[PDB]
Symmetry: D2
Subunit: 331 residues, 4 copies
Amino acid sequence: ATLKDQLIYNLLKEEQTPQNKITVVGVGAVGMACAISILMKDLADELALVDVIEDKLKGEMMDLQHGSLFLRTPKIVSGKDYNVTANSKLVIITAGARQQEGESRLNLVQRNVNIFKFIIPNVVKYSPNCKLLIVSNPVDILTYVAWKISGFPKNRVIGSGCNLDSARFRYLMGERLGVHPLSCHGWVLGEHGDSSVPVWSGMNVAGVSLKTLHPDLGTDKDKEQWKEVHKQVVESAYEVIKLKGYTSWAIGLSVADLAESIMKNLRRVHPVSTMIKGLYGIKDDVFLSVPCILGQNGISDLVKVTLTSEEEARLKKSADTLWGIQKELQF
Amino acid sequence: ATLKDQLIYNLLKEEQTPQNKITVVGVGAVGMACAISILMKDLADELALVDVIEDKLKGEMMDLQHGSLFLRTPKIVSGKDYNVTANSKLVIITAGARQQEGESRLNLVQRNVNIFKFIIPNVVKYSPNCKLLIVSNPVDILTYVAWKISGFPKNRVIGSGCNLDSARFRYLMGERLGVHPLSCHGWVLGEHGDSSVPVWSGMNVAGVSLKTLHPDLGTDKDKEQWKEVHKQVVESAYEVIKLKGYTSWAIGLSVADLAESIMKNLRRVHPVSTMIKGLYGIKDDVFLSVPCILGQNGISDLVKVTLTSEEEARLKKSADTLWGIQKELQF
Amino acid sequence: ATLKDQLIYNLLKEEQTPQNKITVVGVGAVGMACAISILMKDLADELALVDVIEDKLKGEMMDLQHGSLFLRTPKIVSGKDYNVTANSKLVIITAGARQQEGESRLNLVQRNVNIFKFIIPNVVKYSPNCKLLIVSNPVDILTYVAWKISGFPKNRVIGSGCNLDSARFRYLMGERLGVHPLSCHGWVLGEHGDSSVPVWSGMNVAGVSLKTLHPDLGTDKDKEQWKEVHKQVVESAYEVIKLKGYTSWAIGLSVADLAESIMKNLRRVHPVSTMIKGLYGIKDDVFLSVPCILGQNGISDLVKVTLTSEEEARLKKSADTLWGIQKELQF
Amino acid sequence: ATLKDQLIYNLLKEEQTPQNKITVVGVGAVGMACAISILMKDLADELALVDVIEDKLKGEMMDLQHGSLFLRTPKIVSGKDYNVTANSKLVIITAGARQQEGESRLNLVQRNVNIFKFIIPNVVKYSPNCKLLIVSNPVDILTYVAWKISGFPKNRVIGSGCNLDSARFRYLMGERLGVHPLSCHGWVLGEHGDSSVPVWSGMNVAGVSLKTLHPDLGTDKDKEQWKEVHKQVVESAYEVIKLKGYTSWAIGLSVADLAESIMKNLRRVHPVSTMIKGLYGIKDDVFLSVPCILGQNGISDLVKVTLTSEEEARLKKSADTLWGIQKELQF
Ligand SMILES: NC(=O)c1ccc[n+]([C@@H]2O[C@H](COP(=O)([O-])OP(=O)(O)OC[C@H]3O[C@@H](n4cnc5c(N)ncnc54)[C@H](O)[C@@H]3O)[C@@H](O)[C@H]2O)c1
Ligand SMILES: NC(=O)c1ccc[n+]([C@@H]2O[C@H](COP(=O)([O-])OP(=O)(O)OC[C@H]3O[C@@H](n4cnc5c(N)ncnc54)[C@H](O)[C@@H]3O)[C@@H](O)[C@H]2O)c1
Ligand SMILES: NC(=O)c1ccc[n+]([C@@H]2O[C@H](COP(=O)([O-])OP(=O)(O)OC[C@H]3O[C@@H](n4cnc5c(N)ncnc54)[C@H](O)[C@@H]3O)[C@@H](O)[C@H]2O)c1
Ligand SMILES: NC(=O)c1ccc[n+]([C@@H]2O[C@H](COP(=O)([O-])OP(=O)(O)OC[C@H]3O[C@@H](n4cnc5c(N)ncnc54)[C@H](O)[C@@H]3O)[C@@H](O)[C@H]2O)c1
Ligand SMILES: O=C1O[C@@](c2ccsc2)(c2cccc(Nc3ccc(F)cc3)c2)CC(O)=C1Sc1ccccc1Cl
Ligand SMILES: O=C1O[C@@](c2ccsc2)(c2cccc(Nc3ccc(F)cc3)c2)CC(O)=C1Sc1ccccc1Cl
Ligand SMILES: O=C1O[C@@](c2ccsc2)(c2cccc(Nc3ccc(F)cc3)c2)CC(O)=C1Sc1ccccc1Cl
Ligand SMILES: O=C1O[C@@](c2ccsc2)(c2cccc(Nc3ccc(F)cc3)c2)CC(O)=C1Sc1ccccc1Cl
């Protein structure tokens, strides 16, 4: 007999389908940061990685596998073929090269819609009941694209949206007040990135509205310029790219937080991109961030935030812009 | 009054010392994986990052700070100046560029000795009571260098040594047996990397010695080629470099495990590099991996492993080689 | 030589002063639930237990020590003598038998002031720089007693106060809305227990004020009876005592959450009992719950919550009642 | 319209089922310590509690529910009816009053067999695919009883067995050597409690056999009395009962560790009670502890420990005694 058979007596071989499997598509800076965060939070019993660069993909898989002794995820797999992703509860899309210098949004949309045409049918083929979590940019457009190609119901297509924007805002608010970000509440909604909307009415510490205490909050005439907090969210994003060339840790940590609510059915509220048709005068098939309840069926509910006329106008303008790009797309 | 003063009443403004501070020196692939693993394990109340590339350093600091909402480390600081590292309990050295394309594994000696000449006195200036954890290669030589320059007692200079080698070995053992690496015990000692020693006598599952069950274990006569498990440790290290260009995740996870035992005073046993003079016929000031008890004073004790004649001869050969290089170094 | 000396070579026998020590005084239902919660959250490197019943104390210590394999707190000590508590960062008081049936508040305070007269000087003698966290009831009165006897500055004397009341409120709110309590914000302030104040203005989900949406919120004329969410906090407390005889798990978990902010210097905001003199027209030396910023120096700051005239009147009435009892105390 | 419908827009109201449910049967000292440990380890998405004392059951459920804000288990349910336990992955039996002073092993068996006659069919009815984890005493006899009544394959019927005995042994070993119990390996096998077997050959630190270093280990020729390390396991168990009246924390922590390997499919090796028929000359349907690989299918494999003739004779004697009691049982 072999050493294995001499040491171990087998009662059964009968392997089951993975019970809490997560797949990450695209093992770049963002994808690997999502992967390490997910592993360190014990969210999955199986992690699958997919990319088109075979050597980098294998090397990343091996490097994570070599840390198994310090993890509680007994199976890490990878491949260019989507058969490695079979029976995933959650599939995270972080694919396509990051935006290049001088590269426009329309050019990013062009190439990423193209790869989604291959990615999404392959994901759906092997995990037809998965929740799709889109991170790739422009995240609001690509969440619509994933929804359209997949044919999945609204609840199972989630865009990262304004989750990173709100996390950055809460960090900046915390720094300003000398309070941990967990205790500094504030929501950044609408279109992810440059055109996002800070909801000044909800900015609070311990339920004490900062807008009620300081009526000039968020206005350009504010003597203390609290609008700086939202402006620094956009500025810090560009600054990080200027200084290191990409963002990985902050987006990876924010994605693992969404994955935790989904995998553990927590029903916590997060700012994520969802189908907002029928809200704020929006009539088009567009995905924008609102506070969503996240659980085992993805987005089961959304919070109906009271917005000012200015805030509503900004979301409607974003919806018009996004729909303008979307109507010209070919699926 | 400002909005901050309107919202918050201050009881005292007494600036106090960090209680569980960790510094990481060199924010490359290894340093940042050490950082994210330490942050995700809640080991520090303050993290300080140091490097010579100012833009990359600032970008890395900001990226980690932007994930604060999902962490429990309230302060992340960085700087080229070592004043940012003041009062660290643990200082991790992951500095110096990794081994370049046509560079000798040894070419790191001269250039890393030169950078350590400036790093170590600066670390000692601001944290004279810290534990020093050396990761930079050749890790055994550089741990000796850190010890010599710092003037610290033996217990406060720890080399990552064979911690990654043993973690890889236990992953490979686990794969062969169908058992989690946590339950697959085995020790790889001596010189980190190519010249490491697998201690076949200690390889076990549930206290059942694999060598007792299979006497050919670790021999060239073994029809099952169990010796290939240690050889695959060395081969997988080269394979990861070939596939992705560097190793980050596995070393980061292993370093956070050592940091946990130190910060929490666990007194767990780890294979790390320590001053081995007085053991295995070694008379020179050389650092090699043996199982060490790690706690709040660093290495308080070491395990005296019974080695075979061939194992002892390999450690003594490594000591002769390391000392040969070390005696020619100028301080 | 002994087996220990044959197996292990000692580098240094020097033991450092405790670095992250917590003491729990009174190992009853509350004390032990605080103890298990602190241990499972890896908050301390040393846990000390104190009581007057020597056998129960030793049994509780041993029972925790027997679970050491599954914990990361390497030292668990106990004793009737407070020398075991030396150099604690945090001392938690859960001493005195729980309130008996037919026993009045005045009876409860008299008893507990009599034991605090011995406890507090003993705690101060061995840990003069500790933070004191009072749990024993009436918690607001006993926090004042601990502050008076200790002579500590007000930032280092923290009462559990309305932390459990707010946790219960958020659980009930979450059940009604179908949202996790983490995403259901609401503050219960003032006097702990029967006379606590729900601050309806701060009750929100994702920054959306429930009071703004539903102006009858918290009024008796409310068709949806949202006021019952606070009334059920008080009813649920009496119900738990009626059904099992005491509360342990919920208070244990809430105390560990306060211990986490203190030990890790998080600066999160919690509803805890602090010296309220100078706020809400209160002129007496009374401790009431307001949102406090908790860190390594205890309460460094407090949030100035805007209260309605009714809310302010209730806190002032509680201050008058508490002071009325406090002025007659003899210690 | 309601406040809930004003605040939250529902996307779907699909009444879904838990993916990772655990049930605890018997909410006594052991049962509730298992529950709190399981909750603090984030192992379940739903926890069900069952008992026959309805008030105590409801009070325990409520007390856990009130701590929801500090947990990540969104649903805690209870009931006398087993419909609350439907589709549990793991069912833990901690039912039947603890053995009383002057109560014989036979009397404890008889009353617990009677209670299992009702419990086990009820558990099987609602969770036919669950893993059964028996804690109630005499644990080896009651694991056999559960297996007989359930009709489950032997991989899905696990007895707590020598898991607590080995945890206590490793604690005592760690105390003597000044090493954390995680780094002190040693296995206590066979019959749980008084008649358990310490496997001296497997006792090691870092793969260094204590028996090889100290040949008198486990004998009376031992001037250091290492045999007491096993004897003190039995003595400390009686001592804890003498001092506090029961054991809860250590058994609770040990059970949560088994639950973690099962729920997360870790395939770690644990000393648990399994059907040992066909091993060590044993021919009867008896359950004894050996090192078992634990995962999503329960016990998939067992480690074949090489025992000395004396060790083998002690296990066969335990099997004869257990079978002697079992053959007279009425189902
Ligand atoms: N939503 C947010 O808040 C947010 C924040 C930061 C970054 N991002 C986005 O995340 C995306 C990734 O960023 P990055 O820095 O990791 O880029 P990257 O260039 O480092 O990595 C991209 C990876 O995708 C892979 N890839 C390319 N085509 C593929 C395909 N057809 N199938 C599978 N994999 C493929 C690449 O090989 C590469 O490994 C970008 O779109 C970026 O804008 C989003
Ligand atoms: N001990 C082990 O098991 C193990 C395993 C893997 C890698 N390593 C070692 O870790 C080291 C780092 O590897 P890497 O891949 O992260 O290299 P890297 O090139 O990615 O990063 C090196 C960093 O050090 C910085 N640096 C250079 N000089 C400095 C100075 N004087 N002060 C502070 N910082 C300075 C660089 O700017 C750079 O950011 C290497 O020596 C490598 O061999 C050790
Ligand atoms: N602040 C809150 O929200 C909150 C919630 C629940 C309970 N509590 C309070 O916690 C306290 C303890 O409750 P319990 O149910 O654990 O009581 P308990 O009767 O179970 O235990 C009390 C313990 O205190 C010990 N003790 C008595 N005198 C002592 C002394 N001089 N020194 C040290 N220890 C001594 C007892 O021996 C006993 O072990 C009560 O006052 C109770 O009201 C507070
Ligand atoms: N395997 C081990 O290592 C180990 C260690 C310690 C204790 N134990 C055992 O755990 C068991 C429980 O101990 P305890 O101290 O918690 O006892 P306990 O008296 O505190 O609690 C027993 C509980 O079981 C309930 N119960 C009784 N009949 C029931 C039924 N038909 N259905 C459901 N629930 C029922 C009781 O109402 C009670 O709540 C004992 O058998 C004890 O010996 C085992
Ligand atoms: O933080 C990021 O990194 C990216 C970024 C940053 C500024 S605009 C987009 C990112 C990530 C990686 C690469 C690039 N390349 C890039 C950036 C700007 C250019 F003008 C051209 C190319 C960009 C991608 C992205 O969406 C974010 S989050 C973000 C971006 C803008 C404002 C607010 C937020 Cl919260
Ligand atoms: O796993 C690694 O990555 C490095 C490595 C890998 C193989 S030799 C050294 C590493 C890290 C980063 C860069 C490079 N560059 C490199 C490597 C080999 C060459 F021949 C030339 C250049 C190397 C550095 C290192 O020490 C390790 S751990 C390791 C190395 C060899 C055998 C066993 C182990 Cl456990
Ligand atoms: O939840 C508890 O348990 C206690 C309690 C519960 C209702 S009044 C006091 C508690 C704990 C232990 C024992 C007793 N004994 C008792 C209870 C009621 C009586 F009328 C007489 C004696 C009481 C002690 C206490 O402070 C709390 S928390 C609490 C209490 C009232 C309202 C709201 C909350 Cl959040
Ligand atoms: O640690 C325990 O507590 C119990 C125990 C302790 C000593 S014998 C049984 C236990 C738990 C709760 C109550 C009682 N009551 C009891 C105790 C002794 C008697 F003689 C009669 C009744 C017993 C139940 C039990 O199995 C254990 S573990 C254990 C028991 C004996 C030897 C070694 C171990 Cl590791």
